[PDB]
Amino acid sequence: DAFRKLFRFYRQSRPGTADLGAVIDFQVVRFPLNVSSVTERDAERVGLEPVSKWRAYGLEGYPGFIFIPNPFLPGCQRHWVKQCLKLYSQKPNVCNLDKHMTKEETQGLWEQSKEVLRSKRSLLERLRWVTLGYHYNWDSKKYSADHYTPFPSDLAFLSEQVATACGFQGFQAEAGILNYYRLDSTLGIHVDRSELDHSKPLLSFSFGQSAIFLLGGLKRDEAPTAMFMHSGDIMVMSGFSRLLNHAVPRVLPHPLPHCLETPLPAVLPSNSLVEPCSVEDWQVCATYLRTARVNMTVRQVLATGQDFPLE
Ligand SMILES: [Fe+2]
């Protein structure tokens, strides 16, 4: 339980201390990306700056582990979190509130939360996860072609470009899992093995408040290494770093960030998947993200020539 020992270590807040400086803000190497793999027009279309200005990092003993500090164009974060909270939750996809709350109670989430923010505990505070594409059955720990809703296009294009730049051009976005946090929310010690195609990488996107991650080998026995994950930061776990045990011990609060300080531009490209945000949407997103953090994992389920067995 060495991983759990560091998990309880950092779980003791201790902000701005020896603990704050024991992590790896952005052993450390730079990962040569491929500015040739993507064009600034598609990256503008999805709100990421030219790969020529991206910086990627890896660590010794963790090959294929890619950390990329915030590459998002200034302001783009706002759209992604918005669609994360305003759109991706409701009826077509699946969230945790579907188990004991009916679709009528959940459909009125955004507007009733706007009335709640205007009036000054609602459901958006109670959100814990959303699944996109092939809906992960938590109980079964399996995927199924039977439980499926179409993967959001813009999100898929994002994951596709990022995975292309990181060296996997044949990446179709099939499974999505968007974790939502409270301040005290955590993510447990686990490996990410529910998929059938392990070759394709796991694409994590951090937002909201800063958080502390961890990276340990396939055996939970191997002690973890700890690093930050600010808003906009992106982890691409590939090759070896895909069967590696990881967690999120804390959402560290404000000593909302600076990437949220910079707003959207009025002029966005005509083919851009980055989209406009009404003002009260960044109001509720801005408050909720002053409270806590969001995470966006994207995954390949099936290999290119593989399909779910029948039996
Ligand atoms: Fe995970």
Residue ranges of domains in the chain: 2-299
Known binding-site positions for Fe cation: 190, 192, 246
Q: In angstroms, what is the span from residue 183 Cα to ligand 1's centroid?
A: 19
How do beta strands 175-180 and 129-133 pair?
Answer: antiparallel
**In sequence order, what are the beta bridge partners of 148?**
134
Residue range 2-299 forms a domain whose CATH class is mainly beta
Q: In angstroms, what is the span from residue 233 Cα to ligand 1's centroid?
A: 16
Q: Provide the residues around ligand 1 (an ion) whose CB is within 5 A.
A: 192
Judged by DSSP in three states, 8 sits in: helix
Known binding-site positions for 2-oxoglutarate: 179-181, 293-299
Q: In angstroms, what is the span from residue 211 Cα to ligand 1's centroid?
A: 14
List CB contacts of 307: < 8 A, sequence separation 6 or more: 145
- φ, ψ of residue 179 to 5 degrees: the values are -80, 135
Q: In angstroms, what is the span from residue 111 Cα to ligand 1's centroid?
A: 32
Q: In angstroms, what is the span from residue 117 Cα to ligand 1's centroid?
A: 32
Encoded tokens for 182: 């409270």
Give the full edge-to-edge strand order of the sheet including 215-216: 187-190, 245-248, 215-216
Resolution in angstroms comes to 3.1
DSSP string for residues in 120-180: ---HHHH--EEEEEB--BTTTTB--TTSB-PPPHHHHHHHHHHHHHTT-------EEEEEE
DSSP string for residues in 168-219: -------EEEEEE--TT--EEEE-----S--SSPEEEEE-SS-EE--EE-SS
133 φ/ψ sector (left φ>0, alpha ψ -120 to 50, else beta)? left
Q: In angstroms, what is the span from residue 253 Cα to ligand 1's centroid?
A: 22
Q: In angstroms, what is the span from residue 147 Cα to ligand 1's centroid?
A: 21
Nearest Cα neighbor of 154 from 67, 82, 68, 226 is 82
Count of CA atoms in the C-beta half-sphere (13 A) of 256:
25
- φ, ψ of residue 288 to 5 degrees: the values are -55, -30
Q: Gaps in the chain (C–N > 2.5 Å) come after which residues?
A: 26, 120, 255
In whole angstroms, what separates CA 26 from the centre of its chain? 17
CA separation for the pair 212, 236 (Å, rounded): 16
CA separation for the pair 31, 241 (Å, rounded): 14
Buried b (16+ CB within 10 A) or exposed e, 158-194: bbbbbbbbbbbeebbbbbbbbbbbeeebbbebeebeb
Q: In angstroms, what is the span from residue 296 Cα to ligand 1's centroid?
A: 11
Query: Do 95 and 103 touch, CB atoms closer than 8 A?
Result: no
Gap between the terminal Cα atoms of the chain: 38
Encoded tokens for 231: 């808003």
Q: In angstroms, what is the span from residue 192 Cα to ligand 1's centroid?
A: 5
Nearest Cα neighbor of 68 from 141, 151, 159, 130 is 159
Known binding-site positions: 110, 134-136, 179-181, 190, 192, 246, 293-299
Q: In angstroms, what is the span from residue 222 Cα to ligand 1's centroid?
A: 16
Residue whose tokens read 């070896």? 240
Q: In angstroms, what is the span from residue 191 Cα to ligand 1's centroid?
A: 6
Q: In angstroms, what is the span from residue 76 Cα to ligand 1's centroid?
A: 25
